Amino acid sequence: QIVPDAATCPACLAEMNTPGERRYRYPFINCTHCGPRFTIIRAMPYDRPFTVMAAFPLCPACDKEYRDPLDRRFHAQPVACPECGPYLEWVSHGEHAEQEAALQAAIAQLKMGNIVAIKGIGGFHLACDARNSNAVATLRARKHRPAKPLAVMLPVADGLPDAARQLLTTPAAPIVLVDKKYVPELCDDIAPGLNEVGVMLPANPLQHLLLQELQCPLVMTSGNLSGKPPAISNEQALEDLQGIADGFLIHNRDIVQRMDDSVVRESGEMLRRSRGYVPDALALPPGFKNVPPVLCLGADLKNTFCLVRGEQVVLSQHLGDLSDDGIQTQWREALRLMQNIYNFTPQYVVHDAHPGYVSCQWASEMNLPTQTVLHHHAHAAACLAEHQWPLDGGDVIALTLDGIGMGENGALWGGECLRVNYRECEHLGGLPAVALPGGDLAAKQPWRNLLAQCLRFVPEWQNYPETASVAAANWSVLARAIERGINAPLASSCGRLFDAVAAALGCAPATLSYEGEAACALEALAASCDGVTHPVTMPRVDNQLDLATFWQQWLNWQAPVNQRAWAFHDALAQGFAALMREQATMRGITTLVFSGGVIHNRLLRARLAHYLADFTLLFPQSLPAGDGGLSLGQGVIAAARWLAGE
Ligand SMILES: Nc1ncnc2c1ncn2[C@@H]1O[C@H](COP(=O)(O)OP(=O)(O)O)[C@@H](O)[C@H]1O
Numbered sequence: 001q002i003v004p005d006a007a008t009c010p011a012c013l014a015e016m017n018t019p020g021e022r023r024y025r026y027p028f029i030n031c032t033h034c035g036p037r038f039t040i041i042r043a044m045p046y047d048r049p050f051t052v053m054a055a056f057p058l059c060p061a062c063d064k065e066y067r068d069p070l071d072r073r074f075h076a077q078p079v080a081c082p083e084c085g086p087y088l089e090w091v092s093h094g095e096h097a098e099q100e101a102a103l104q105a106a107i108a109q110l111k112m113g114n115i116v117a118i119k120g121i122g123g124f125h126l127a128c129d130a131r132n133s134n135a136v137a138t139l140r141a142r143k144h145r146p147a148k149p150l151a152v153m154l155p156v157a158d159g160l161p162d163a164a165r166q167l168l169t170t171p172a173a174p175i176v177l178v179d180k181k182y183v184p185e186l187c188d189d190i191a192p193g194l195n196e197v198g199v200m201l202p203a204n205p206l207q208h209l210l211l212q213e214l215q216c217p218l219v220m221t222s223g224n225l226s227g228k229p230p231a232i233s234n235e236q237a238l239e240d241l242q243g244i245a246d247g248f249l250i251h252n253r254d255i256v257q258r259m260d261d262s263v264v265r266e267s268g269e270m271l272r273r274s275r276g277y278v279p280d281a282l283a284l285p286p287g288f289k290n291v292p293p294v295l296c297l298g299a300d301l302k303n304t305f306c307l308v309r310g311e312q313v314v315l316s317q318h319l320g321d322l323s324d325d326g327i328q329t330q331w332r333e334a335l336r337l338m339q340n341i342y343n344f345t346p347q348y349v350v351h352d353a354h355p356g357y358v359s360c361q362w363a364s365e366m367n368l369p370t371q372t373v374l375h376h377h378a379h380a381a382a383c384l385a386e387h388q389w390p391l392d393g394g395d396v397i398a399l400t401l402d403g404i405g406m407g408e409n410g411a412l413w414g415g416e417c418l419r420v421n422y423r424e425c426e427h428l429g430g431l432p433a434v435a436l437p438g439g440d441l442a443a444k445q446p447w448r449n450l451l452a453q454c455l456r457f458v459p460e461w462q463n464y465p466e467t468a469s470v471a472a473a474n475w476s477v478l479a480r481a482i483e484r485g486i487n488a489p490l491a492s493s494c495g496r497l498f499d500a501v502a503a504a505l506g507c508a509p510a511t512l513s514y515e516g517e518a519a520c521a522l523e524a525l526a527a528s529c530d531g532v533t534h535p536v537t538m539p540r541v542d543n544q545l546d547l548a549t550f551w552q553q554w555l556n557w558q559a560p561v562n563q564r565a566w567a568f569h570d571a572l573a574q575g576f577a578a579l580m581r582e583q584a585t586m587r588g589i590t591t592l593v594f595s596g597g598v599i600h601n602r603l604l605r606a607r608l609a610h611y612l613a614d615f616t617l618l619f620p621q622s623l624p625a626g627d628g629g630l631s632l633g634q635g636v637i638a639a640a641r642w643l644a645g646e
């Protein structure tokens with residue numbers, strides 16, 4: 001079996017740090033228990049000739065170890081030493097170095113506050129001293145990344161909570177989100193406006209060498225360009241990062257698969273599932289057996305595909321945005337190797353119901369029967385599957401909160417109450433559908449959503465201080481477009497409602513630099529409030545939330561901004577809980593499901609759980625609540641359909 005890429009083990013670390021060992025300070029040390037796996041395999045079987053390491057014939061000493069059944073490096077396929085293996089290369093504006101001198105040049109650059117691109121297991125990172133305000137500002141400037149939080153690598157996990165240390169030190173070695181109070185060494189520009197920082201430990205030998213020497217936290221963020229697939233070759237990294245890195249610490253061992261760092265919360269909640277988890281399979285729920293080979297294409301954003309067969313499923317790594325130029329290359333390579341590893345040939349392909357998706361174009365090219373699943377149905381089913389809900393387990397009431405997904409009859413959904421089982425999805429109610437003014441711009445400029453909300457629900461909205469910048473603009477042209485339905489489609493979007501509230505509070509830039517920025521800012525603000533007595537509500541009118549009442553109460557409830565933010569989360573949670581309670585109780589349903597990327601909001605989850613203690617509650621945990629989990633949901637629905645003989 002092939003296991004996921006694994007953090008350097010204690011024994012290899014000990015060996016690398018022992019003067020006199022053949023592998024002393026050798027940056028590519030590995031053994032049967034650790035090192036790259038998926039990222040170095042060209043084809044099955046797992047054997048050196050079909051790995052990236054085929055072009056580095058073993059010296060006699062390595063060969064003896066590789067062939068000795070009692071040795072820790074027995075059949076360690078990518079094993080090497082300084083005499084036979086890959087080596088470091090340093091490149092910086094006409095300067096060049098190799099091996100230990102390459103490492104030392106990179107260290108000198110980091111110490112001096114410069115930015116260096118570093119080759120990792122699954123791509124390249126950009127690094128700098130995370131304490132150094134100037135370096136971090138320069139990185140942000142050069143990368144055109146004014147706000148999005150930066151991952152940091154710490155030399156050790158000392159001082160972090162037990163739960164965080166546990167996760168950090170696993171073979172998966174994920175980025176773990178922790179409260180920034182635990183890491184005071186980090187400059188304020190690491191995660192501005194947020195309450196958490198993503199921290200990670202060195203997990204390959206080169207990272208251990210660097211952190212051992214540097215003894216300080218380092219930014220360790222992905223080395224790519226917005227809109228472009230990440231580099232896995234030296235040549236692409238050199239091209240992509242030329243304006244950004246001051247120098248390049250690279251090497252001649254090929255990476256053949258894109259494999260980003262995984263991201264989890266200290267709580268264990270999975271956000272991004274890549275390095276260290278892929279290509280591990282997962283068991284399907286009770287009742288799923290003898291399932292035909294189904295390829296599930298997942299979603300256009302934060303993509304993963306799924307292979308379903310028999311009684312198991314295997315998810316791909318994070319493959320990013322499918323609309324990005326040239327992203328299909330890494331996607332197809334991932335699919336090639338996954339199919340090879342599992343001897344898998346699909347007989348069916350499942351994809352999203354949105355006819356405009358890139359994935360839905362790709363599906364049309366496969367010469368296989370195709371079928372669709374509604375976006376929000378797949379979110380709900382993915383949560384059911386992770387909780388091992390049996391095939392015949394019965395209906396649940398589901399709350400699916402996100403940005404936008406296509407619902408029934410071409411409606412744009414994003415804040416819905418649904419009656420759900422693996423075969424069926426009935427829409428019951430939710431947020432009212434409100435125009436997205438300027439289409440794609442509405443996710444980029446929170447004020448557009450505040451305008452759309454005000455036009456629908458707020459008498460004399462121009463008179464409120466919250467709406468001042470919108471009021472001062474010639475907003476009437478946009479209001480005319482909205483009335484005429486010109487690039488202003490209606491969407492019942494929970495993400496856009498967050499943005500409207502963030503716009504009203506002023507807690508985000510007028511134009512965002514990354515998706516979800518306003519929502520995360522609003523949550524971070526609300527989280528600093530420990531709870532408050534407040535009059536804000538979202539009453540139920542028929543099967544929808546009454547946002548006219550909400551805005552009237554919220555706009556007229558003056559309080560510190562953190563309390564206003566908290567009141568919004570609390571009112572939204574109470575309103576959705578009342579809708580779900582009515583729908584479930586009158587259907588004899590005792591279990592509620594929650595999914596969609598908005599459910600990554602910890603405060604909203606906490607308030608929902610507070611209001612719904614009279615039900616069994618299922619929240620996502622080992623798979624992302626957002627689009628990274630979508631393909632699993634598609635897979636279980638397709639399987640359930642097939643098992644019913646549909
Ligand atoms: N402080 C943080 N809060 C939330 N997410 C974070 C944080 N730091 C890193 N991340 C995660 O990292 C991913 C961002 O990708 P990228 O732009 O490559 O940044 P990086 O490589 O620094 O993680 C997101 O999925 C996000 O979940």
Ligand SMILES: Nc1ncnc2c1ncn2[C@@H]1O[C@H](COP(=O)(O)OP(=O)(O)O)[C@@H](O)[C@H]1O
Binds near residue numbers: 402
């Ligand atoms: N902390 C948060 N609070 C509220 N909403 C959030 C938060 N984090 C992300 N979101 C929203 O969830 C969306 C991602 O949801 P997801 O289901 O992954 O994608 P999609 O909208 O494409 O279906 C983000 O674009 C943003 O709208």
Ligand SMILES: [Mg+2]
Binds near residue numbers: 158160183184
């Ligand atoms: Mg500390």
Ligand SMILES: [Zn+2]
Binds near residue numbers: 012035
């Ligand atoms: Zn090892």
Ligand SMILES: [Zn+2]
Binds near residue numbers: 060061062063084
């Ligand atoms: Zn050797």
Ligand SMILES: [Zn+2]
Binds near residue numbers: 375402403404596
């Ligand atoms: Zn979604």
